[PDB]
């Protein structure tokens, strides 16, 4: 388990969404290194225009988070490998619509694949999301994780910067069960959103650093 993340690991991400009737598909490819809690990914939409800002999808696209070598006992994500785990989430955007997510994170050879499906409902156009009024960036957050004794689950809020100056919050409720146990801790997350030099498609370059505490 902890064996597989001792070096450089390539990543593959697939996501499928449906927000108020608007469908789309995002393909993600790159590389991650759990030793320093670093992953560099590039996401490409094949349906063209997104009906939803990239920052909101960031949390929906953790086995590469750096756990201190005395807190390896709290790393559930690496213990489930290479069998994998399921990642269920229901993101509650403040004063707007919500997300529903179930992901499949497992090893398919030499790469780690993340199969995701998303559902968006009750979103208001004229809001921060459908109007695309959120800043193309990501703040620092704390992912409080509790243990799921009879087999984990996490809780955290995301602060999306609005172009006007306000902040769009989003409560995240997470549940993880292994496909094939820690005390209450949390993770410190840092993420950078960017674009690439020669890429005329709607995309998102992602560099993220996460460390346990």
Nearer to Cu ion, 18 or 171 (CB): 18
Nearer to Cu ion, 19 or 41 (CB): 19
Nearer to Cu ion, 18 or 135 (CB): 18
Spatial distance between the Cα atoms of 95 and 149, rounded to a whole number of angstroms? 33
Residues contacting residue 103 through CB under 8 Å, at least 6 positions apart: 60, 86, 87, 88, 89, 114, 115, 116, 117
Least distance CB 97 / Cu ion (angstroms): 15
Residue with the closest Cβ to Cu ion? 18
Whole-angstrom CA distances from 72 to 94, 106, 151 are 34, 19, 17
Residue 74 DSSP symbol: G
Least distance CB 123 / Cu ion (angstroms): 15
Spatial distance between the Cα atoms of 84 and 113, rounded to a whole number of angstroms? 10
Residues contacting residue 73 through CB under 8 Å, at least 6 positions apart: 182
User: Rounded to the nearest 5 degrees, what angle is found at the Cα of 82, between the Cα atoms of 3 and 7?
Assistant: 35
166 within 8 A of 159, measured Cβ to Cβ: no
Least distance CB 119 / Cu ion (angstroms): 6
Least distance CB 47 / Cu ion (angstroms): 14
Nearer to Cu ion, 18 or 88 (CB): 18
Q: Which of 173, 175, 171 is nearest to 93 (CA)?
A: 171
Site string for Cu ion, 3-42 (x = CB under 5 A): ---------------x------------------------
Least distance CB 50 / Cu ion (angstroms): 16
Nearer to Cu ion, 15 or 39 (CB): 15
Residue count, binding to Cu ion (CB under 5 A):
1
Contact residues: Cu ion, CB under 5 A? 18
């Amino acid at each position: 388990g902890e064996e597989l993340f001792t070096g450089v690991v390539p990543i593959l991400i697939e996501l499928d969404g449906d927000v108020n009737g608007h469908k789309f598909f995002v393909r993600g490819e790159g590389e991650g290194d759990a030793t320093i809690g670093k992953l560099s990914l590039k996401f490409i939409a094949t349906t063209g225009k997104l009906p939803v800002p990239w920052p909101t999808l960031v949390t929906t696209l953790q086995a590469f988070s750096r756990y201190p070598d005395h807190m390896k006992r709290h790393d559930f994500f690496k213990s489930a490998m290479p069998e994998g785990y399921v990642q269920e989430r229901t993101i509650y955007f403040k004063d707007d619509g919500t997300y529903k997510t179930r992901a499949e994170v497992k090893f398919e050879g030499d790469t780690l694949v993340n199969r995701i499906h998303l559902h968006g409902i009750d979103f208001k156009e004229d809001g921060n999301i459908l109007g695309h009024k959120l800043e193309y960036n990501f703040n620092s957050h704390k992912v409080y994780i509790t243990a799921d004794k009879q087999n984990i689950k996490a809780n955290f809020t995301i602060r999306h910067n609005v172009e006007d100056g306000s902040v769009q919050l989003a409560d995240h409720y997470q549940q993880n069960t292994p496909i094939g146990l820690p005390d209450d801790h949390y993770l410190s997350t840092q993420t950078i959103l960017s674009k690439d030099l020669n890429e005329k498609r709607d995309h998102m370059v992602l560099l993220e650093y996460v460390t346990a505490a």
